[PDB]
Structure formats: structure tokens, C-alpha cells
Amino acid sequence: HVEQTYLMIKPDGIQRQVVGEIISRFEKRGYRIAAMKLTIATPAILEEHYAEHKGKPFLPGLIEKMTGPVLCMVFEGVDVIAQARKMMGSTRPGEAAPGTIRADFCQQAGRNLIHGSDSAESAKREISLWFKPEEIQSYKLALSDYIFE
Amino acid sequence: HVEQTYLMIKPDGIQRQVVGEIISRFEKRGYRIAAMKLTIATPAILEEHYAEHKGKPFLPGLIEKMTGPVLCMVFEGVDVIAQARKMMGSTRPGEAAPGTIRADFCQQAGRNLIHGSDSAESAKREISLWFKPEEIQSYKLALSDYIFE
Amino acid sequence: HVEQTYLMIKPDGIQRQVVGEIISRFEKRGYRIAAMKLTIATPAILEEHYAEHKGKPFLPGLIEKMTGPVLCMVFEGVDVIAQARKMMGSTRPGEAAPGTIRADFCQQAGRNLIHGSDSAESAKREISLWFKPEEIQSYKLALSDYIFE
Ligand SMILES: Nc1ncnc2c1ncn2[C@@H]1O[C@H](COP(=O)(O)OP(=O)(O)NP(=O)(O)O)[C@@H](O)[C@H]1O
Ligand SMILES: Nc1nc2c(ncn2[C@@H]2O[C@H](COP(=O)(O)OP(=O)(O)O)[C@@H](O)[C@H]2O)c(=O)[nH]1
Ligand SMILES: Nc1nc2c(ncn2[C@@H]2O[C@H](COP(=O)(O)OP(=O)(O)O)[C@@H](O)[C@H]2O)c(=O)[nH]1
Ligand SMILES: [Mg+2]
Ligand SMILES: [Mg+2]
Ligand SMILES: [Mg+2]
């Protein structure tokens, strides 16, 4: 049984030109690209994306940092929501484990390269926010017999 | 004082075409390739390899998944039995530490890319099962003075 | 607020020809190269460098193993003293976390590839020992807005 998670490369990932390296880490585990789109995030969509932080003092500066080019992604795999969070590492790069994206690429939480859904409910909500159903692509990986039990 | 461990790239490592990447991880630490052989694992040899699991319900499907091309390897180094196990990571990739082979490449225990001996006794048994003595090569690494104390 | 740490590639890092790989790991986090110099370490300077270890049983052999080409480096970043130590990993490569330099490249404490300052005080002292102030270069990284909060 597979699930789908929402992963988003933030503007610092675009501007530091590590998009391909990020994608390769997820492809390396046999996770399937189910959707992908480059866009420029707007405050209106970011307010909904970060609805959990509404009213908090840091929300205006988070939205400002995120107003820029982003790569919206959906990846599919076993336990991929929790696993992608593990691969990303802790919010604060200095506390993230070696070998995670944030530890390997970043210094501070405010520029930590990538977002990933933190739960099944948030993944469903975030995928629906950033993608229309017609943009989610269903196909089978040819190596499936060697990736899955 | 060095020891030798038996490492085997399973059919998923061959079919996903990551053999060279796996070998490079062990070469990177200055471990010496003492033996290397491509073969196709058969049920009779796999029954002896997995003798500890005889009779268990999961063994038949394990043998089926392992019936395929494998790369038999012997690596030599300080504490290499335990260290190779650490490098592979937990049997279940989702529990494996970031930076390990199974965490970086895999999703499920039944397709977890690689086997390594779990003890000195199993290394001796497994090397004897999969290799003839003529296939174990004795030579010295030229960089030894910069690898070992 | 950024700080500066002293990092030194030991003779095993030079001789195994992994200098570039080491530098890339620090550049990948947006750490800035503030100083860099190839020299051959001599006992007199190494005695001052390792002054804290005076009298310990491994010191004479440590000085012998360190008498050779070294790459002196200063890197700048947020919390870079502690973070570089985390990236290097434990003194013993066998205890170091997967994904650290020592775990990925080495086997034994006596050949563990790299030195890094362990504190703000030792970083100040080591930078002054190996570099004159005129050798420390100040410039701003063009991607600073995407590395720092
Ligand atoms: N619950 C399970 N479900 C699926 N496959 C399993 C399970 N438990 C074990 N396996 C498979 O059987 C192998 C042998 O189990 P075990 O010897 O306990 O793990 P290991 O030593 O980490 N791996 P191996 O290289 O096969 O010896 C595992 O590597 C998996 O490929
Ligand atoms: N500067 C700064 N940014 C933060 C802090 N906490 C969170 N953020 C930013 O806000 C984003 C969303 O916060 P959160 O959902 O709690 O963290 P995440 O799930 O790891 O992305 C993070 O990824 C960070 O970029 C903080 O303490 N300082
Ligand atoms: N052979 C050997 N070398 C050691 C030992 N302890 C320390 N060293 C070496 O001495 C160096 C400096 O020691 P220390 O400052 O404690 O370790 P570091 O801060 O991790 O570099 C280490 O990096 C090792 O190369 C030991 O027990 N045996
Ligand atoms: Mg979050
Ligand atoms: Mg076993
Ligand atoms: Mg020290």
C-alpha cells in the first residue's frame, strides 16, 4: 500500500539551483513522481498553505520569504509522508541529522530549502491546494517488482 | 587487525543498476575487495544461506525474491563485519538511519538491496558457502599507510 | 551572526586525494571559504596546535602522522564551529554517524582525515596559529539572501 505526499522546493532551492539534486534523492528510493509544476507562489495561496500559523507574528515574514518561484511536487511510495519528512530532517538545519536534506544543504530554519506534508490529513489538503486532480498522473514504475514486496 | 565479511548485492541491486554505487560506498572507506563474483542464486544455495529461517512462513517468498542475479563480495577492513552492517542500515528501510544504504535506496524489507554477515561465525559460514577458496584474493592496498593506524 | 572555524585536511586526506570532496561538503551548506593554504605541517607547529594533548600517550604518534602535507582552511557560517564538528563526526570513524566525513571515508581514529576547532576559543587560537590576518579574506556570498534568514 502506497501513499502520496506533497513536497515543495522553496525559492532558495530554486535560486541555489539544487532542484535536480533534491529530486534525485527521492527518485533514488524508487518514489514515483506523481505530479510536478513550477509556479510563483502568491501570498493568497501561501496564506492557505500556512493556515495553521494564522495570526502568529512570524507568518508575514514566512510568506515574504516564500513569495517566489517554487517547485510543487507529489511523490508516491510506501510510508512516503513520514519517510520524506525523515529525509528532509528537522526544521532547524543545525538540529537535522547528517545525511538529511536540511543538514546537508542549509544553515537556518528560515532558509531550509524544502517543505513536506507532515501527516496524512495535511498531505491530502496540500495536494488539493496546489494541484487540480487532472494534474495528478497515474502510471506504474517498471522496476516495481524490485522496489516493493 | 582486519577481518573479512560476506556482502551480497541482491537481485534488486542488480536490476536497479546500482552495483557500482554500492561498491563505491565500501571502497570509499578503504575497504579491500578480497572476492567478487556474479552468479545467479538458486533455491538450493539460498536454503543453506537462510538455514536459520528453515520452516518459517516467510522463507518461500524470500527465496523467490532472491532467485536471480546476485553479486557475491568479500570486503576486508577493521571491524568490517559490524561496520558493513551499520552502513547497510536496519533491515526495514523505513527504520534505517539517513545515510545508510537501505535508507538511501529502499522502501521495504523484502527489497532491501544487500545482505551482510551478522557475525564472525556467519561470515565464515557464508564465505565458505558462496565462494571457493581460489576466489579469495590476498593483496595489500597501496594506501594502507593512510588508511590504518 | 556568523562565526569562523579552523578546519584542516590531514595528510591522509591529501594522499587519498579527497580534498575536493571535503571542500564540497562545506560549500554545499553555503559556508564561505575565508582562508585556504596548502603547507607541510612540522613538529614545532603541530606541538602548538595540539598543546592540549601534551603528555597523552598518543601525542608522539599523532605528531608523526600529522607531519606531512595539510590543507589549512577557514570556513564561515552560522554556528559553523559546532556544525563542522557534527559534519566531521566522532573521533573514531567506527562510532561516527552515517553521513559524516569520518564515517563515510575512514576506519580508525589515527587516520580520520580532518581536524576542526572544538570551541570558539580554540577556533580563534588555531586560526591565528596557522594564518596571518592578511590571509583571511572578507567577501559576501552572492546567494546570501537565500542562505541566511
Ligand atoms: N517481515 C519481513 N517482511 C519481508 N521480508 C522480510 C521480513 N523479515 C525479513 N525479511 C527479508 O529477509 C531477509 C533476512 O532477514 P534477517 O536476516 O533477519 O535480516 P538482515 O540480516 O537485515 N537481511 P539478509 O541480507 O537477507 O540476511 C531481510 O533482509 C529481508 O529481505
Ligand atoms: N526563521 C525561522 N523560521 C521558522 C521557524 N520555525 C519555522 N520556520 C519556518 O516556517 C516553516 C514552516 O514551519 P513548520 O511547519 O513549523 O516547520 P516545517 O514543518 O519543518 O517546515 C519552516 O519550514 C521554516 O522555514 C523559526 O523558529 N525561525
Ligand atoms: N591512534 C589513535 N589516535 C587518536 C586517539 N585519540 C585521538 N587520536 C588522534 O588525535 C587527534 C586529536 O585528538 P582529539 O582532539 O581528541 O580528536 P578530534 O577533536 O576528534 O580531532 C584525533 O583526531 C585522532 O587523529 C586514539 O585513541 N588512538
Ligand atoms: Mg510544517
Ligand atoms: Mg542475517
Ligand atoms: Mg580536538
Side-chain angles (χ1 to χ4, degrees), chain B residues 51-75:
Chain B
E52 68 191 291
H53 304 309
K54 174 169 188 199
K56 302 185 183 176
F58 64 96
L59 184 59
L62 171 55
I63 291 181
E64 269 193 8
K65 295 195 183 307
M66 286 293 296
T67 300
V70 296
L71 193 67
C72 309
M73 316 182 293
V74 175
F75 276 92

Side-chain angles (χ1 to χ4, degrees), chain B residues 17-52:
Chain B
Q17 303 220 266
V18 295
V19 169
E21 286 192 73
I22 292 168
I23 291 167
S24 287
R25 288 197 181 208
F26 296 109
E27 281 182 300
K28 193 176 209 65
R29 295 189 70 177
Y31 294 147
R32 184 178 71 85
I33 305 168
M36 189 163 279
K37 159 170 69 177
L38 185 82
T39 193
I40 290 170
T42 67
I45 188 156
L46 292 165
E47 284 171 30
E48 296 302 339
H49 179 79
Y50 288 125
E52 68 191 291

Side-chain angles (χ1 to χ4, degrees), chain A residues 50 52-53 85 91 115-118 126:
Chain A
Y50 287 125
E52 70 192 83
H53 302 310
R85 296 279 287 186
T91 307
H115 161 89
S117 306
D118 65 10
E126 289 171 4

Side-chain angles (χ1 to χ4, degrees), chain C residues 84-133:
Chain C
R85 296 277 285 182
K86 181 173 175 178
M87 295 165 76
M88 288 169 45
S90 319
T91 307
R92 290 170 173 166
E95 298 179 348
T100 63
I101 293 166
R102 290 169 176 174
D104 286 348
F105 290 94
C106 301
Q107 294 185 45
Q108 299 191 283
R111 289 298 195 187
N112 66 359
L113 220 71
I114 186 164
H115 162 90
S117 305
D118 67 7
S119 71
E121 179 183 36
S122 62
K124 182 175 185 299
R125 186 180 86 86
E126 292 170 5
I127 292 171
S128 294
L129 175 60
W130 295 93
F131 288 102
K132 314 168 194 303

Side-chain angles (χ1 to χ4, degrees), chain B residues 49-50 52-53 85 88 91 102 115-118 122 126:
Chain B
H49 179 79
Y50 288 125
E52 68 191 291
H53 304 309
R85 296 279 286 186
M88 295 172 5
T91 307
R102 289 166 178 170
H115 161 89
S117 306
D118 67 7
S122 52
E126 290 168 2

